Every structure is written in structure tokens, then in C-alpha cells.
């Protein structure tokens, strides 16, 4: 209730879009982007490492478990995985991260486009 | 044929699965619990044989009032209370069987009796030491030793000891002549003879 | 907006050719091809790439005529890959129904088309129709198998599976409905364990919302829960916490700290007695003693008999 | 790109899985993209690459809103997929049904019957 008053409808400029999934790490090098369209692996089921379910950019589905491994407990929380760059933070951190695709080509938003007035 | 490991308990007080058991093998010593602390084991068994009279003390409403112990890697069987209830309700022999096993745990007590709470912490330590060699002993050359991999202070439960197990026993180990050790072994040399 | 056609029209309006016509090419293409791998050789040796000028080739050339030579050399391929266009669609379309998507295919081929389009040698005379189409096919298959499945599986296994299907069908011939499995393993080389695995392994997922069935009233997945847990558990637990807390927290408050330090009751499992011994007040002979002491204390009836019911 | 789980995807008991059209539209556009980058990388002659973009374009598109303009995507669901828009639209857009109308617990239904003997302001139960 006392967290905010009014909402601010608007648009997401490419910075703001890319500002939906940066998750820059302390290795210092940014992420949030997904370099794979596939989903969980066939052998095991784990989330590749750059696909639609990459943990290191959304979050460790297995609560405090670097996709890499090494840590399987809240004990390891703020600390992340060197080797995987998984952001160890429970799992509710997911469902909220966002990531994004640098586009190899622009796309006239369907909405602005075939809209009733086709604002474009 | 239930069982556990060298570092476990069979149960607590308060825990109502109190029917006569059947230590199939290993000691599975039971550590009768206490208020603040300090638990005798007292109980200590053999093949096949029973322990934990429960549905038998205050009827089937008895509280063990004595925590238990999976002393060595256990091996323990049990039986549906009926065996010591219905199946026991039958011919005496049936009950007698359990009573004979109870008499074993009883004999056990008598064995501790006198040997335990004797007076000295050395004589006493030996009063049942030879006894021990007669229970899980291992005869080998020197003579009828145990060999089981053990403390200095589980031992203390033998006396109320602190370093006696690692100090006084050393005597029997060499200065006094009665046993020897292999990292954590016991070589009772003898039934009596030297050190008597 | 046919898209398929919207491109299909147009490609029409580029017209087909013949070996001879596609021969002037071949040479030119090679003339450009190799030229570059100069460009790479000079790359790799140095500055990582000639990639300057007439020296962007080590070769000699009046520079303008270089870029020109390049243009004609590769323009041949461009004026060839597209020059073909059709036939590849006759191929790709066979996988337009196999999976992926007519357009999706088309591309893939195209990719191939290229590659072939240049890995290709008019010295063996026979037309690319008996070689270009090779590479195509390849390309393609590696797409509906490389994806079109939303859970990538070992494209190799795909074949094994098929191979099994055929081989098992042979068994079925003799042993109808190939009930043989481990006997099929005498020809399957592996326990049905993997055969059945393969079966499931080769499953295509479900929309999560196909409308349910026996009633169009609702999608699927709307009868399950997330990785979360019902409060019923949450609470019980949290009870545990405190239940404990107090119940512990009624014997030696200091030691109680280590009870949470060398253990949990917070966020270490742990602080190895080592570190812990000194953590509270620097100690070596005052730790596992009070440790067991604490346990046996809160152990035994009246004490442990409080978690006796809340063993959570 | 949506935080994954909302496009959740899920093991189903029988082993089968519960794919979500979200990750699907998506993944599509991924390929198309990548590939296209590889097309300009291979400097393919336009009209492919051209074509291509065109596609991409509307992959994207459909993602946003299927069936809006070009040909409604229809995947293994053997029906139009479910674009980003529409899951928050209609009678069942998020709005109107999970959101003004959620589906609480601490409840109980039943048939009903006259409760004589029991007075008003009372109920059986």
C-alpha cells in the first residue's frame, strides 16, 4: 500500500529493454542476455546456461545452487559461483528477472503498427 | 533383523514401540538415559537375543524411561508384541523363552553387579575387563583378549574416569602385565596369571 | 501476405540457367574464393589480415581492379545461389511438412546452398543437381533435428531411435508387435531400460494449455502448483523454530549461542568447533563437552520429549 | 523476455513435458535472429537476407500478438498459439479473470436444501 502512489505507463527504449536483464556480475561482465532458444537439456534437466532458462541470468531454479555446483544451501547466498556465474539467490529471484535479446534487425512494434490509428 | 551403526541409539524414553526385541548380532549396548545426563549403557548382547522389555513393565503403557543405543553396528531383530503378548499368553515355554532371554539381560546385571561400583577404578576396570574378554573377547595368542575399537572414556563410563583409561590401562598394557594395543586394540593376555 | 509465395513469386522472377552458363561462374567463383584465402593467409601470418589495400591482398593488383575481380568472382556465387532458388524449395518443402516451417526450411537450405555453391567443382562435370542437392539436404536435416523440438535431444540418438524402429519392425515381422525387448536387445545392444528411455526421450511436450478435453472449458497446467509450498508446511516449520528456540533457550544462554553457532538456528550449519571454540571466548577443552552436554540436556524425556511430537 | 517461469515449463509425471508457447514464440525468434546474423555474416545475397529479415520481423511480431497481422502461428498445440497479448486480454486475459476474479480457498459448495427447524440468519452446514 505505502510502496507507491501512481503508475507510469510508457515505452521501453532499447537501453531500458537491455536494462531489464543486465545482471552484471563481480567478475565484472554483463549478462541477462540469452544466446540460445532451446530449453532444459535432454540428458539431465538443467537449464543449459544461456537458453530460455539460463540461470545465470534469471536465477538458480534450485534455490542456492550455482548451476555449476559447489554450493547447495542458503549458507552460500550473497556469495555466487566462480565457475558458473550463477547468481545464488534462493529461486523466487526468478519469475522476475528479465532478459532480452539484442535484435539483429528492428521490428515496427505490431502495436504501433497495425493499430486502429496505426500511430506509426 | 533391524540394526544401525557403531555410533547410534536404539531409542529414547517416551518412545512406545516397547516390545521385546532380538539383537540378532553385535552388542547394540543400550544406554539407559538420565535427567541432566550420564547414561549407563547397561545392556549388551549376543546373537539372536532380546532386549528392551517395554510392553511388559507398566503393562503396554510403560514409558521406556531409558534411552537406547545402537552401539556397534547393530544387529537386532524384533517381533509383533503378540509374540510376547498373545503368542506369550500361551504355553509357559513361550513366555519362558522371553523370560530366559530376560534372564540373560538379568545375568548381565549380576555380572556388572560387584564388578561395577566395586571401589577402586583400576581393580573395578579389570573386575569386568576379564568379563569383557569373556563377552566380545577375542582370544588370540597372548590370551583371551577382546579386540574392539574403543575410547579412553567410554571407558570413563566404566569408572567416572578422565585419563585413567589412557593412563592406568597403559600400566596393564606394559608397566603392569595384562594387555597390549594395536592403535585401538585390546590384548588381554590372560584370564588370571600375571596381573591376576 | 502468402510470405512463402510472396518470396516464391519473386524468385520466379529470376530465371534458371544451364551448366555452360553456370560454368563461367564456376571459374569466377573459384577466382574469388581462392583469392580470399590468400586474404586469410596473409591474415593469419600477419597483422591478422592484409586487409589494407591492394595489399589487403599480398597479391599484386591494380587496386581498383582487385575489388572488381572480387565482385565478379563472388557475384557469380550470388548470381548462382539465387540463380538456383527453385529445386532447393522442392527439397525444403519436403521438410515443410516434416516440421520446422516451409520458410524456416527454405532458409536452411539456403545456407547449404551456399556452402555447396561453392564447394563445388565443375570438373567433375556432372551437374550440381547431383551434388548441390546433397548439401542441401544436409543442411536441412540439421535444423528440424537441431531444434523444432523444444527440448534439443542428441540428433545422433534420433537416428539410433529410427534405426531401432526399423530393426525392431524386423523383429516384429518374426515376433509380431516385437514383444521382444531384451531379446530385441540381442539386436538392440542395450537393455530395454534405454529402449524405454528412448521412447520417453523421443516425446514432444504439450502446450501447457491445450484446452483440457471432455470439455473445452480450460487449458492444461491449471490443475498443478509451482515449486512453492503450502503454508501448512511453512508454518509447521516455523513453529519448529521457536519451539525449539525457547526450549533450547532455557539452558546456559551463552552455550545456547554455540548451539546456534556450531550448528544452525540461523544461517550457518556450522561454525567448525575450531573456529567456534575461539569465536565465543577462544577455547579447545570447553567445546564438544558442552556440545554433548547441551544435546543430552535438551535430550531425554521432558526435554527432547517436546520435539517428540514436533520432530519437524 | 519473460522471466522464465512464467513461461514455465514442466515435467509432467508421465514423463512428458509441459512446454509453454511463450518460450516457443520466443525461441523461434531467436533462431531467426541468429541465423540472420550468420546470413549477413556469410554476406548471403540479399534477397535471402532480405527475406530473412522479413521473417524475423514477424516472428517478433507474432510473439507480441499472434494472429494479428500475418498468419497465425499454429504449433504442436494444433491451434493458434498464445501470444504475449491475449494472455492478458480477453474474457480471460489476466485482467479479467485472474485479476478481478480470483479463485480463493476457505470455501465450500454444495447442493442446497430447505433448512426448516433451523431459523433464518442460520445455516446448515
List its traits.
part of a larger assembly, 4 chains, B: 196 residues, mainly alpha, two-stranded antiparallel sheet, 4 strands, C: 312 residues, 13 helices, 0% strand, RNA polymerase sigma factor SigA (chain C), sigma factor activity (chain C), transcription (chain C)
- What spatial order of strands do you see in the largest sheet of chain B? 1-2
Cα-to-Cα separation, first versus last residue of chain B: 39 Å
How much is the radius of gyration of chain B in Å?
Answer: 18 Å
Tally of strands of chain C? 0
Protein chains sharing the most extensive interface = C-D, 31 and 38 residues
Write down the secondary-structure element order of chain B: EEHHHHEEHH
Radius of gyration of chain C: 36 Å
Order of helices and strands of chain C: HHHHHHHHHHHHH
Q: Helical segment tally of chain B?
A: 6
Subunit structure (chain D): In cyanobacteria the RNAP catalytic core is composed of 2 alpha, 1 beta, 1 beta', 1 gamma and 1 omega subunit. When a sigma factor is associated with the core the holoenzyme is formed, which can initiate transcription.
Family (chain D): Belongs to the RNA polymerase beta' chain family. RpoC1 subfamily.
Protein name (chain D): DNA-directed RNA polymerase subunit gamma
Function (chain D): DNA-dependent RNA polymerase catalyzes the transcription of DNA into RNA using the four ribonucleoside triphosphates as substrates.
Description:
This is part of a larger assembly, with 2 copies of chain A, 1 copy of chain B (196 residues) and 1 copy of chain C (312 residues). Chain A is largely without helices or strands. Chain A is built from 1 helix and no strands. The longest helix of chain A is centred in the N-terminal third of the chain and has 5 residues, at 14-18. With 196 residues, chain B is mainly α. Helix content of chain B is 28%, strand content 5%. In chain B, strand 3 and strand 4 (144-146) form a beta hairpin. Chain B is elongated and about 55 Å long. The N and C termini of chain B lie far apart (39 Å). The relative contact order of chain B is 0.13. Chain C is mainly alpha-helical. Chain D: Keywords: DNA-directed RNA polymerase, Magnesium, Metal-binding, Nucleotidyltransferase, Transcription, Transferase, Zinc. Chain D: DNA-dependent RNA polymerase catalyzes the transcription of DNA into RNA using the four ribonucleoside triphosphates as substrates. Chain D: Belongs to the RNA polymerase beta' chain family. RpoC1 subfamily. Chain D: This is DNA-directed RNA polymerase subunit gamma.
Amino acid at each position: 500500500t505505502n510502496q507507491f502512489d501512481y503508475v507510469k505507463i510508457g515505452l521501453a527504449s532499447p537501453e531500458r529493454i537491455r536494462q531489464w536483464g543486465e545482471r552484471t556480475l563481480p567478475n565484472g561482465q554483463v549478462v541477462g542476455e540469452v544466446t540460445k532458444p532451446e530449453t532444459i537439456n535432454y540428458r539431465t534437466l538443467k537449464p543449459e546456461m544461456d537458453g530460455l532458462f539460463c540461470e545465470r541470468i534469471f536465477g538458480p531454479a534450485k534455490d542456492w545452487e550455482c548451476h555449476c555446483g559447489k554450493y547447495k544451501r542458503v549458507r552460500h547466498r550473497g556469495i555466487v559461483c566462480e565457475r558458473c556465474g550463477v547468481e545464488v539467490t534462493e529461486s523466487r529471484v526468478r519469475r522476475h528477472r528479465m532478459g532480452y535479446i539484442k535484435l539483429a534487425a528492428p521490428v515496427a512494434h505490431v502495436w504501433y503498427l497495425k493499430g486502429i490509428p496505426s500511430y506509426i | 533383523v533391524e540394526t544401525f551403526e557403531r555410533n547410534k541409539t536404539i531409542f529414547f524414553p517416551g518412545d512406545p514401540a516397547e516390545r521385546v526385541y532380538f539383537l540378532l548380532k553385535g552388542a547394540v549396548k543400550l544406554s539407559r538415559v538420565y535427567e541432566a545426563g550420564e547414561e549407563i549403557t547397561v545392556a549388551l548382547l549376543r546373537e539372536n537375543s532380546v532386549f528392551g522389555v517395554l510392553s511388559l513393565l507398566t503393562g503396554n503403557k510403560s514409558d521406556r524411561f531409558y534411552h537406547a543405543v545402537a552401539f556397534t553396528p547393530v544387529e537386532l531383530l524384533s517381533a509383533p508384541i503378540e509374540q510376547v503378548e498373545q503368542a506369550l499368553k500361551e504355553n509357559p515355554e513361550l513366555s519362558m523363552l522371553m523370560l530366559r532371554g530376560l534372564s540373560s539381560r538379568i545375568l548381565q546385571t549380576e555380572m556388572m553387579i560387584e564388578t561395577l561400583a566395586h571401589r577402586d577404578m583400576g581393580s573395578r576396570l579389570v573386575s569386568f575387563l576379564l568379563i569383557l574378554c569373556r563377552d566380545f573377547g577375542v582370544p588370540c595368542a597372548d590370551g583371551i583378549t577382546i579386540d574392539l575399537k574403543l575410547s579412553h572414556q567410554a571407558i570413563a563410563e566404566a569408572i567416572g574416569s578422565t585419563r585413567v583409561t589412557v593412563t592406568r590401562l597403559l600400566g596393564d598394557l606394559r608397566e603392569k602385565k595384562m594387555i597390549s594395543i594395536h592403535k585401538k586394540k585390546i590384548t588381554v593376555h590372560k584370564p588370571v596369571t600375571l596381573s591376576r | 501476405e502468402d510470405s512463402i509465395r510472396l518470396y516464391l513469386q519473386e524468385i520466379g522472377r529470376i530465371r534458371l540457367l544451364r551448366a555452360d552458363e553456370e560454368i563461367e561462374l564456376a571459374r569466377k567463383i573459384a577466382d574469388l574464393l581462392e583469392l580470399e584465402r590468400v586474404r586469410e593467409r596473409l591474415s593469419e601470418k600477419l597483422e591478422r589480415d592484409p586487409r589494407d589495400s591492394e595489399w589487403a591482398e599480398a597479391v599484386q593488383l591494380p587496386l581498383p581492379a582487385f575489388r572488381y575481380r572480387l565482385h565478379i568472382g563472388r557475384r557469380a556465387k550470388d548470381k548462382m545461389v539465387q540463380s538456383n532458388l527453385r529445386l532447393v524449395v522442392s527439397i525444403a518443402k519436403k521438410y515443410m511438412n516434416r516440421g520446422l516451417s516451409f520458410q524456416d526450411l527454405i532458409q536452411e537450405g539456403s545456407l547449404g546452398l551456399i556452402r555447396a555453391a561453392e564447394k563445388f567443382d565443375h570438373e567433375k562435370g556432372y551437374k550440381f543437381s547431383t551434388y548441390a542437392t546433397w548439401w542441401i539436404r544436409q543442411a536441412i536435416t540439421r535444423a528440424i533435428a537441431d531444434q523444432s523440438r523444444t527440448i534439443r535431444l542428441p540428433v545422433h540418438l534420433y537416428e539410433t531411435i529410427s534405426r531401432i524402429k526399423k530393426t525392431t519392425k524386423l523383429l516384429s515381422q518374426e515376433m509380431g508387435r516385437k514383444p521382444t525387448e531384451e531379446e530385441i536387445a540381442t539386436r538392440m545392444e542395450m537393455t530395454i531400460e534405454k529402449l524405454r528411455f528412448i521412447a520417453k526421450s523421443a516425446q514432444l511436450p504439450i502446450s501447457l494449455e491445450t484446452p483440457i478435453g471432455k470439455e473445452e472449458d480450460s487449458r492444461l497446467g491449471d490443475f498443478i502448483e509451482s515449486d512453492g509450498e503450502t503454508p501448512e508446511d511453512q508454518v509447521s516449520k516455523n513453529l519448529l523454530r521457536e519451539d525449539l528456540e525457547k526450549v533450547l533457550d532455557s539452558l546456559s544462554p551463552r552455550e545456547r549461542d554455540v548451539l546456534r553457532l556450531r550448528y544452525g538456528l540461523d544461517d550457518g550449519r556450522m561454525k567448525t568447533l575450531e573456529e567456534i571454540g575461539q569465536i565465543f571466548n577462544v577455547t579447545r577443552e570447553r567445546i564438544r563437552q558442552i556440545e554433548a552436554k547441551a544435546l543430552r540436556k535438551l535430550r531425554h524425556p521432558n526435554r527432547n520429549s517436546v520435539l517428540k511430537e514436533y520432530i519437524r | 523476455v519473460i522471466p522464465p517461469d512464467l513461461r514455465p515449463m514442466v515435467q509432467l509425471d508421465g514423463g512428458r513435458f509441459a512446454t509453454s508457447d511463450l518460450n516457443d514464440l520466443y525461441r523461434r525468434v531467436i533462431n531467426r535472429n541468429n541465423r540472420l546474423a550468420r546470413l549477413q555474416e556469410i554476406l548471403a545475397p540479399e534477397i535471402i537476407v532480405r527475406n530473412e529479415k522479413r521473417m524475423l520481423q514477424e516472428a517478433v511480431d507474432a510473439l507480441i500478438d499472434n494472429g494479428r497481422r500475418g498468419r497465425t502461428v499454429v504449433g504442436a498445440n494444433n491451434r493458434p498459439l498464445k501470444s504475449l497479448s491475449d494472455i492478458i486480454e480477453g474474457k480471460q486475459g489476466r485482467f479479467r479473470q485472474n485479476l478481478l476474479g480470483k479463485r480463493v480457498d476457505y470455501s465450500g459448495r454444495s447442493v442446497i436444501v430447505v433448512g426448516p427447524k433451523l431459523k433464518i440468519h442460520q445455516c446448515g452446514l
